[model samples]
Target: MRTYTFDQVEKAIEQLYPDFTINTIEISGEGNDCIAYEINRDFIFKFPKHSRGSTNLFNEVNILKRIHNKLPLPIPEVVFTGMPSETYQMSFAGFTKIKGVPLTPLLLNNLPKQSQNQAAKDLARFLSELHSINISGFKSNLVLDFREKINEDNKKIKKLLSRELKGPQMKKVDDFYRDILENEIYFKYYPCLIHNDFSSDHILFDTEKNTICGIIDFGDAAISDPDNDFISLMEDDEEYGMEFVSKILNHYKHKDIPTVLEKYRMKEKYWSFEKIIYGKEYGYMDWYEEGLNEIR
Candidate 1:
């Protein structure tokens, strides 16, 4: 229930570096509250924002603090964490800037086949290591409930289906939600700490090393089925899809993978529009618009 007062945040930032001004605040894609900026490149500022009442960022910060040094990945160093002072109104954590161009979708699409495959492998391995973490110390109440989420989503889909639904899209969403509930057998479980929002944008690449060098942003860290991370790869298709999943699950080499990938898959649903429907029905528009959808 603790929150940063505005003056407290200002003082901390001042204490860290007195000669800086927060000239700009831009929301990073993926969700709201992820405000990134520059303090003259002497340091890059990333304020992974979260509601004072929510537990995701707190969990992310805890995970980062516990594993910053232990993992073989490039997680940013946490410089400060607190409620903002009078000058600022949100909770934030600062990190020592890491260097590298973000491997945007445009950048990823342009890479050669070998590069893409290798990138997939690297990501797969990174996720493998992340899922393997001893998250015993990572604390949070933000546990996953695929069934609950799916049930909630189903209610929305049904409402949408009753409406015009325009194209077959509404039907598709409806069908998917219902089928998942009916065939819940495909779901498997392994409650592990996972980077629930691991996407290409969160990854930083060292073109020189030809591998993923840094992973930034843990705003979506949660104790959930490992299968949740696999959704990000699904948009890319079965090839890269299988590639990334295999790397994560050890390409069938590891025996810990959920036998029912589909159950998890079926229960998982990600539709920006559908979420809006649910948000509005449940009166979470402001918070949803605030970019706390995934974590909340």
Candidate 2:
């Protein structure tokens, strides 16, 4: 995997879209899978840091196009798609930049209670609208089915736990998995297209407006269990997370929410286990403390 620098990214953008001129290119973000450059004030160009992300570039563009105007918040619109080049081995994408800062967990928790409730409601509404959209006829290679996905994760987690955890911690982890597997009937659900990576970094907010401006990062978007979307809710401060969950239940009433909520509880434990074993790979050790403090 190549570490994409601003120079390589800028060169690729220039090569792909010669007419799109900009004097200043600044690093907007550099994540494990990709690196983004804020081009002037209007556009953001993203270059995948690895082959896994590169493979999703076109599908993400298609998914974004399919969901355009479907949700209240703005999503990235792929304006230009860059082909693989000698300078850059993987495909890249560019989009009109959404204006706002990341609605970090800390930021969301610091907002006044009324604002927090409104934010919760706003986000819940967005997910409700997104989940309600019928993708029955949509075809994409990027979407993952629910049962296979969770089973795969369970296997991976078990393998890692056996290797990493021991004694009391091991028993607790194994017991949680056993409990979920024993009651696996509750885990069954109809598939919905979900923002599988719905987290604070992807949720953009306008601090001045005290409202969610947009949602970004569809690299992990998929057709899966709706509960997969809510796992990140646990990433917020405990009280705030519970408030968001309550608001979500209030606004997005579906028979599956209750069942999925139960599933999310178990999935939350798996995520904590994931952070412990695959922390560097997932880049989420910071979440360990948050996960520890969570009232399971």
Candidate 3:
């Protein structure tokens, strides 16, 4: 059986949206938290892994409801709340499927100069609006999910490397772990909510209108560092990453702030390496190869 199956999601969608019978159910996309799917024309259903269970769906719903009205543009709208049912075996959320292409692909397209500017400006605006959300209660709940588990797993990998890997391979892993823990600035006061995994992949762009039409997938949303979202927009991706940094800072002008460079470094240290190791050990050949390149 598939670790995540279509039947599991189909049942979840059926329960969440009793209004419309699903014409067809198909896999959409996936990430760490949930397996997403198109539940006919009206909505997309995100079925989370039963292993990690579900976090506070209400919190996710609340974040959407709180920000739904005020943003400069439309974003993901929560359509229904799901309870853990027999089929899905876990809780899920159904969202109105927003329209747009992911920004990654759009950047490759040849567009009018005005379109490119609007896309960049709109992206800056979307991130700015997200970071500006009042995260008074947003302490990143993923302390357990992202931080603790990753650290523990890396520790285990380090020990294993002593037995399984040798020489510089083991040394490189050791250095990577050290770097992961280096730049994490403990906030005197933590913000209560943030879109933890903010990136181009999560954003949707409307090419016809040249605007960031919507933001989708909030599985990693939690109360965490305001600086945390900056991890995705690295110094390498943009021509003027620092310029984008200033734009976001201008939009989310607040008392508590830190450098984006720190967050990107954390990803380089832990997140990317963690995936590569997980891939290698678990027979993810591609991941193993990628990890070898990155670590070496």
Candidate 4:
């Protein structure tokens, strides 16, 4: 699905910086929308894989700039922003390198206990800094409209997954949306900036320091419920589980710890349906089956 190539990137970079030499272009990573290239090991350039990737670059650039130097950990600094070209349909971004490897929750299992404790603190500080940002006049790129959106997706789930999904499990999905709409739990939080995809891969870990050095890829970051950020920390899928999450929350400034836990637990239940939806769109039958296995 990579619409662009290394030569195209090299040519694009050459055209953008006439005097700069290109010795090497290494493929760093790939996402659903973009393919990343590490240019001469100094800067990182990301090219959109499709037309929709254009805005993600724009949003990420602006977000990194806005939150620059505002947090304890580092984030990429945009050195250049490229305009859309005839060959490339989307605008792109180049960032100064931040050195670290992506940290996954499983990586935590091997980390020293002391380092893990410090990471929990660092995580708390990061969230506090992020959630406290003034969000006035900030237009959300993604809306978390709780009711109809889920009901809409629920219908979709029932369509394909009904045969496989067990009765009580399907009821769990239905009841989640029902109680949320009835109680309006989704509206309970103050709208604020959140690293919506605070996935492990997005966090860069310094192995020597044994701490998160930076966070990267704000492509789908949000201005919404702060509690949503806590979900991954509590999830056992990667095995960090409740112990680490409780440690982070203990250091977090947000006082309503109990409710955050409540909200996180509630939101965790709907993850499978989302995977099924995406699996359908991406032609990922394995993902579809993965979601099915969870619900069944």
Cα lDDT tens digits for candidate 1, 21-69: 7554333332444445444454444444445423444566667787787
Pick by lDDT: 2 or 3, better one: 2
The TM-score of candidate 4 is 0.86
Per-residue lDDT of 177 in model 1: 60
Top-lDDT structure, candidate number: 4
Write the candidate numbers in order of decreasing TM-score. 4, 2, 3, 1
* Reference-based lDDT, each prediction: 0.60, 0.72, 0.62, 0.78
Better of 1 and 3 by TM-score: 3
Q: Evaluate model 2: give its TM-score.
A: 0.79
Best by TM-score: 4
* Runs with alpha carbons beyond 4 Å of true place in candidate 3: 1-19, 30-33, 51-53, 56-59, 85-90, 105-109, 112-115, 136-150, 167-169, 179-192, 235-258, 269-272, 280-282
Model 2 worst lDDT run, 10 consecutive residues: 287-296
Ranking by lDDT: 4, 2, 3, 1
The estimated TM-scores of all candidates read 0.68, 0.79, 0.74, 0.86
Return the lDDT, model 2, position 195: 92
Give me the displacement of residue 115 in model 2, in angstroms: 4.3
